[model samples]
Target chain A: MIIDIHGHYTTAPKALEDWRNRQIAGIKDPSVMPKVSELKISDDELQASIIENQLKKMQERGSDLTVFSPRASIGDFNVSSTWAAICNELCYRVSQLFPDNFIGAAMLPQSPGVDPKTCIPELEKCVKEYGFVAINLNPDPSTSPPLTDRIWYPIYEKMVELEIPAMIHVSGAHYLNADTTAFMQCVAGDLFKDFPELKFVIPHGGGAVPYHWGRFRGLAQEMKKPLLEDHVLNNIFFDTCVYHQPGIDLLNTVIPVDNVLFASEMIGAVRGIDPRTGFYYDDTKRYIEASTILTPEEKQQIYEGNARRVYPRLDAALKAKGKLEH
Target chain B: MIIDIHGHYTTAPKALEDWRNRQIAGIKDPSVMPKVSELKISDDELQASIIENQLKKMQERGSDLTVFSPRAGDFNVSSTWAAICNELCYRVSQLFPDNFIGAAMLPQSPGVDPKTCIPELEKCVKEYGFVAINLNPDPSGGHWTSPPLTDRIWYPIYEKMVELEIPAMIHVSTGAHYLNADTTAFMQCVAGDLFKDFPELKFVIPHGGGAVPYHWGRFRGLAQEMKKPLLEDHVLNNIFFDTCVYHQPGIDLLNTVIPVDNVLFASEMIGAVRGIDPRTGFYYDDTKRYIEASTILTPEEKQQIYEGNARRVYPRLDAALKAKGKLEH
Candidate 1:
């Protein structure tokens, strides 16, 4: 079972984008403010959204299951909450409709600078009510430059309690920087010491962490932390969303097999073909398959075993479905 | 006193070329083999080479100082050729003292790994006290067989560059290869999160950033599509462009579109277009002429492009000048 841990509803039905634009305009001018009920995506819209786009993408790319979440960049509070509520239900509905192929992860109705206390409502609603296996945590909700500071404690606490892993970030250069910044903040803050059981999957191949391993390692040591092997490696995980062959080799070389999970955030940004490679840059499954660094056992761990271990609820949910024996 | 960031030692004495040609010939026929010291260039030869050409052109314009380096290219013998050219550049800087500082050239043969360039990168930086380098993005020359700047294939050089703190001027050696790769290199950095990998790294894309300024919308939209931050955040923080655009309208378009802070003054002096333009009655390589005619730039912004931004981008040059008491606060 190849479990791609990072996936987004980038190709959500056209109605979602139409309504979101209306919601955006409504933020400045209330005359166009959309009510949740005004947005209507039919069952066919939902099925086509999945089957023609993401479902077809999965079949062509050879990924078995995806941790499907709402299209990111939804809201910053006023319009965000309602839109997240609207998008979250579709993710939940899809998982219910295609339980074997899609597992629900969720979006928080984050208020940008608002207290994490506000996000807990949607987070709780997703994990307990929708049976979501993970959550997409946008660390930089524009104003929050923190990942391990007090601002995020509420979300981490809820995640630990819910037994769900938080995938950091959903772009800009921030897509790349946030991935590294969030990873570094955790390293500098010694975040795992407070909650050893909590898990963080730094998608985009732990951006810059594996490539700048020398700088990161020296800094971690200078800060008087244990080897990164002991510090965050236990709780922090990286995915295979990295774009090319050279990238995947470095990811496998620098990160432990245990900390690596399989993911490719596709049909999203970087959806074009790399002219030189003659393959889609986001078709990262090929990069992983071409890795000379990872053994077959290590490859298995990355593809399925590691993701199952990181997201415990995913493990439990899959076990209940007879997808796993242990 | 304008400080030009983009320059080439294209006027290195005829003997230097004679020796290099023999060295190239030596690769195929051993008799043409010439020893490095066997090619002795006197101070008078070096003096006339620059005094008559680069210095002559810089004087014709108003720029006084240049961050000079060996001409940019890739070749097979690799190591020996780079050391010889880089040493000649350093020697010119030493001989001129007040007029020029050194930027190193790496022995980047696309056929070989980038690691091969590291030893020369260090020697030029640490051993010779040079401040910058010229990185040929398509070192395989026209083939462009190497990966983009963001690839790990270039990481070893980047590692050394970051540690040594030198910026690489992305000056692809001539042709459809040059202009196309300038734009291509910008997209390459845009496509990958290179600044995230080495946050302190700096790259100066020469030749008015190829089609970058004119096609800013194309690049901005591409960055948006790639899920990168605005071109400023994604590219400008670590990458910069040069003023080698070569005409009145081209210079105005460049100065108008690019932020002044990202702009650096340059004349690819005695490079590319050396003949006088009948339209202007001045050498086309007289880039200071274009910057002077820029109605878009304020004198203050011109100051920034002339000396301020170059100092900021090339810290070692700034530091060296400060030590000499030439750059007083």
Candidate 2:
């Protein structure tokens, strides 16, 4: 039972592509030729390029299955309401084509002028109806640092009820109007690295949080007394792709290896090579194979065990495929 | 006055070539039978190469003054005591030339039989009162993982250094032994990084202490109340090194920006090259040239950078050469 805990998908490919072309078309009209907007490929072509690249890499890696979502696409800092919907649709089609190879983790439309209430039906369609492993969220794009708002608490509560882990992934490096990316990310990890009892997988490997794990853990036990004694947030999980070996060492030292998930954040818009150095579809397999820190039994547990612990649907999927054991 | 803060004279070009020949000879020896033993570079060749290679590099760099010394030589590891007298003798000969260069530090026969101490001093006298570095002891070798050697082994090196009036440089590295281990050496920074603060003004920086600033300050502030304040212990040593990094930022971040009083500029003939990563060397200059928020100073202060700091420490060096008409003041 092999389950990759990390993956992404998006219908935004066509939608955003079409949105751009619509804007381009409106400007390129013969009546408006005097406006003269410089041109590039239409959005559909652009989105096709992204989808083809993802498909090619998946084929090359021979991955058994990948969890997919277009969360990053919707979270794209520059994306608009129309583009976001089109992207979400593209994400649906991707999962539909490779139902066995790919699984969808639907993205909730949580940006301005887009009521996320519209996403409730999509979430139901993707999860209960379509059987996705989870729903991805940018958490709070409207909040100052985007990750700290209480506005997303209901969504988190809903995920807990659905027994799905909320993927708290950072979308871009635009600074988002604050230099506290390092600080806020560290703070997020502190909430978890120190407490250890949180359920959701917070993003950025807690930022620079692991380096000072001991301090955070001490704070959890000693400093955050009320929460430590009451909340006891111990269900936290972390992604293994923290960019380098030192980070891996720190993460493994602080968290139980089995609890860490293998996630390869795919940058769908970009192509040619991976910017994160080691995280790509193929790298997902390579990373799993190379984690020498895990014992074979523990490796097996991680390779799929803990993932199954999250997505019970995995067991049924494996059972239906008649490939229940490895 | 120009001063080279870091340079190596131990294995001279001729001696290296000689050693290579000796390796060939040993390989072809009919007695290749004799158990890989009894073959060694004649002490004279070792000694002469150390001096000549150093002199050649110094002359080529057109250095006005230099603090020449045996570097990374005389390793007693595996119990082979070698090359202290020849270096001392070479320095002895160099003093007479007067205008060429002068010595700042050299190695003492550490890890070797303690018996070589006396003859080592004889060569020191040959240099006509030139001071040479006694020993840059890293009881742990460059591996950074060894237990501290009791000061006993260091006593020989320390005594010689004190006698010669040259300060011990105490260079370090994470050598071949811990190849890719999980230790701090394999990480961003180790001894070379923060330990820059440990040495006074003359300790040399080797392999450019791996990225210490990345975390040293944070480590120091966080670990202050501990019994040893371990970070401070590693930082007290005064370290100086050459501006071998050609890029501007390396010098700016590491050399020009740090306390110039402890930095030195140097050139060497035989040393590690850019190897598989060519950018490694170019960034050396970049690090030195980096202009941070704090870098608002005159050009002279910047010129009086690494090696310029060396001049302040060893005024006698450039002064002596200038007196001999070898360099302009």
Alpha carbon RMSD to native, model 1: 21.5
Q: In model 1, what are the clashing residue pairs, if there are any?
A: A172-B228, A172-B229, A173-B229
**Which model scores highest in lDDT?**
1
Please tell me what DockQ candidate 1 reaches: 0.01
Q: How do the predictions measure up, each by TM-score? A: 0.56, 0.41
Mind sharing the TM-score for model 2?
Answer: 0.41
Tens digit of per-residue lDDT, candidate 1, span B1-329: 69988888887767888888888888888887888878888888888898888887777788889988888623557788888888888889888887889998888776678888887888888878899999988876656577889898888988988888889898776212365567678878988998998998999988777656644533554565766788878879898888876656556656655798889988777765565654457766677877877788989998899999888888888888888785554
Q: Backbone clash tally for model 2?
A: 62
TM-score of chain A of 2: 0.68
Interface RMSD of 1: 17.3
What is the Cα-based lDDT of residue B205 in candidate 1?
89
Fnat for candidate 1 (0 to 1): 0.01
